[PDB]
Design a protein that fits this description.
Elements (H helix, E strand, L loop, with lengths): L7 E5 L7 H8 L5 E8 L6 E9 L2 H9 L4 E2 L2 E2 L1 E4 L6 E5 L7 H8 L5 E8 L6 E9 L2 H9 L4 E2 L2 E2 L1 E4 L2
Antiparallel strand pairs: 1-3, 1-6, 2-3, 4-5, 7-9, 7-12, 8-9, 10-11
This protein binds N-(6-methoxypyridin-3-yl)-N'-thiophen-2-ylurea.
PDB class: rna binding protein
Keywords: fragment screening, hnRNP A1, UP1, RNA/DNA binding protein, UP1-fragment complex, RNA binding protein
Assembly: monomeric
Length: about 160
């Protein structure tokens, strides 16, 4: 079974009227939920406006994020994977032979790409062996950076969030 941390979505922006039960009924549409909690004040029991769900598999997490925007009890919520919410990554170790279509063909299966920037030397124009990819949405980056490995154009690349 995949580590539970990778099966969790933190849900921000909840309606204060959302409950464990109503959050579960909503998010069960996209997979089996092993956990579903609305965070509440320990004294007043008033909702703190966020919670989390835990799916049985990572593919269910994917399915849930692909079904965004989620309107839950009348309010659009903000689901994010557990870990810095950015849309850009640094891709290192691609050397001089890696081109734009290599990066695009690989990274477009993580999300919609808006910019690919292959870095070149300011003086010579030679490729410097790293690039930046900007996506239209943060979940692409979140999926990317929790992988142990990235292989592009035969290279094992180092990939991290970029600000
Ligand atoms: C380790 O990642 C975490 C851990 C705790 C948290 N707490 C939160 O407030 N969760 C969120 C609400 C909406 C989106 S993120 C977030 N991310």
């Amino acid at each position: 079974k995949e580590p539970e941390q990778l099966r969790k979505l933190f849900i921000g922006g909840l309606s204060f009227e959302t409950t464990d039960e109503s959050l579960r009924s909503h998010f069960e549409q996209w997979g089996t939920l092993t956990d579903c909690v609305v965070m509440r004040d320990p004294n007043t029991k008033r909702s703190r406006g966020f919670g989390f769900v835990t799916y049985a598999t990572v593919e269910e997490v994917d399915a849930a994020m692909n079904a965004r925007p989620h309107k839950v009890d009348g309010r659009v919520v903000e689901p994010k994977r557990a870990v810095l919410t950015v849309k850009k990554i640094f891709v290192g170790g691609i050397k001089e032979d890696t081109e734009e279509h290599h990066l695009r063909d690989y990274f477009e299966q993580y999300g919609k790409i808006e910019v690919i920037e292959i870095m070149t030397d300011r003086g010579s124009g030679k490729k410097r062996g790293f690039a930046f990819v900007t996506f239209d949405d943060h979940d692409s980056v979140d999926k990317i950076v929790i992988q142990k490995y990235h292989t592009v154009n035969g290279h094992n690349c180092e990939v991290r969030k970029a600000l």
